[PDB]
């Protein structure tokens, strides 16, 4: 009886940094996925294990939409069985991922002359992230045997790094807004269905 709030996610004025990626829980609504795949603003629409054209006639207990901003070169890291700084330390998809990865260039929105340094990514982590794990820690990364005591220095690196988003940079360097759709069937009563 109520539309699923996909517009709040895809058209949001501000997107989160990839290390602190947002997640929108979608429940108890009717979703019209046609407004997504029939669009022309998307440069990447990669789905695994499900067809978007077949989503308007399926029911799920819950749907999750994750949003963040990364470089163009790192968009290929948002995929099952992928490896890299984004895939290992910021946002990780499972090997059996069932959902869609949607990306589009946002150089006009997320880039400014002189550099937009508001978007961050995690650079150092001792172990890879689990699938769908969010790590927002800002503690000094201890690269040696000496405790850092919260001050950056030798063998003590700040775990986060800033993107230097400038509008004149190459396409791979330009910011890209990414939305990842996750579809969950918990064998509970389903509340996220398509139109009837």
């Amino acid at each position: 009886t109520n539309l699923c709030p996909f517009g709040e996610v895809f058209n949001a004025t501000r997107f989160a940094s990839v290390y602190a990626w947002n997640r929108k829980r979608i429940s108890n609504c009717v979703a019209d996925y046609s407004v997504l795949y029939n669009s022309a603003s998307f440069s990447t629409f990669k789905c695994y294990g499900v067809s978007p054209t077949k989503l308007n006639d399926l029911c799920f207990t819950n749907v999750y939409a994750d949003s963040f901003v990364i470089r163009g070169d790192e968009v290929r890291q948002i995929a099952p069985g992928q490896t890299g700084k984004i895939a290992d330390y910021n946002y990780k998809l499972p090997d059996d991922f069932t959902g869609c990865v949607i990306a589009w260039n946002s150089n006009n929105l997320d880039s400014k002359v002189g550099g937009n340094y508001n978007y961050l990514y995690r650079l150092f982590r001792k172990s890879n992230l689990k699938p769908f794990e969010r790590d927002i820690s800002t503690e000094i990364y201890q690269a040696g045997s000496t405790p850092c005591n919260g001050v950056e220095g030798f063998n003590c690196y700040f775990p986060l790094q800033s993107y230097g988003f400038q509008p004149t940079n190459g396409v791979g360097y330009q910011p890209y807004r990414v939305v990842v759709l996750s579809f969950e069937l918990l064998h509970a009563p389903a509340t996220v269905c398509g139109p009837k």
Partner: antibody
Amino acid sequence: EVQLVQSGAEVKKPGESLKISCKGSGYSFITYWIGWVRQMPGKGLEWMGIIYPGDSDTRYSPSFQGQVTISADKSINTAYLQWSSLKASDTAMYYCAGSSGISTPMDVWGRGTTVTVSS
Amino acid sequence: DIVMTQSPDSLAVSLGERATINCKSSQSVLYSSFNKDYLAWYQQKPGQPPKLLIYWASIRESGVPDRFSGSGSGTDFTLTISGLQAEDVAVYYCQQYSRTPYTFGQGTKLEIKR
């Protein structure tokens, strides 16, 4: 609805190179992976590979790894399948099939391209 | 790596009778916690490209008549034609798409049994 248009029939001598094309159009094509299927005269269907035109994400069948090259041109929505050197055993009909996402069925099919390799 | 074997190789069914085609999978064709068998059935009429009939082993695609039904789970799957018509003469392939590489069955030849 997505539609796939393939290149014309090819008649080649053994040893010559060949590149056939498959151009797609229609709404929701951004969600489509282009796969290639080989069917020799009177035989069954053989999956060769698949590619996503947006980032050229290509996956090959092990039976065709190193024998053919699969590429795409996202500016014209065209996927390609080429041989460096043709053999007479390459004589077959080559379909291109589109699927909305990977690990999904191929719901749209091209008309097919006949390739004849003979001396 | 997953081998699909169809039974029988050739089938002769009279008009209006029931056509049964079986597909056997060497491994399970599941993909995730979706609990769906990633199995598909295709129809190829003489001189025509293949046409997708059923996906997820039971869900017929848009435009496919109601006489086409798919059943089975695990490693055993079946395609059934309820009211056999002259239009249905074709070769029917089963395909798994759980993971790459995709593999087709050898195909089942279906003809009118007059």
